[PDB]
Amino acid sequence: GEGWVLGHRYVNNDKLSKRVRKVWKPQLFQRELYSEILDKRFTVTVTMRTLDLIDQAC
């Protein structure tokens, strides 16, 4: 629910005026974790905020 989200943009956020479609893409950063089951260090470029949920999923 992040990658490739294309919405619409307005000026005063109340529109009697023009509406122009705007593109939105998620932020990408590197997250290094360690899997003991697979015995492998993993690198995830995935969603930042999701990692905050993963930390609560442990």
Partner: protein
């Protein structure tokens, strides 16, 4: 978030205790270096256990 320290570092609390630190300091230091763990009631029982047997012996 709430984390369980495997060791005593600086001023937080006693070793094994569950304390809430900053997100950056917590995630970028404690977790990857094995200095601490997340908060799971399962191993929080281990917290209460080790702590109980600490002041005991």
């Amino acid at each position: 978030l709430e984390l369980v320290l495997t060791q005593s570092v600086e001023e937080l609390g006693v070793r094994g205790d569950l304390v809430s630190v900053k997100k950056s300091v917590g995630r970028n230091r404690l977790l990857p270096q094995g200095l601490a763990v997340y908060a799971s009631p399962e191993n929080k029982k281990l917290f209460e256990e080790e702590k109980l047997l600490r002041q005991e012996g």
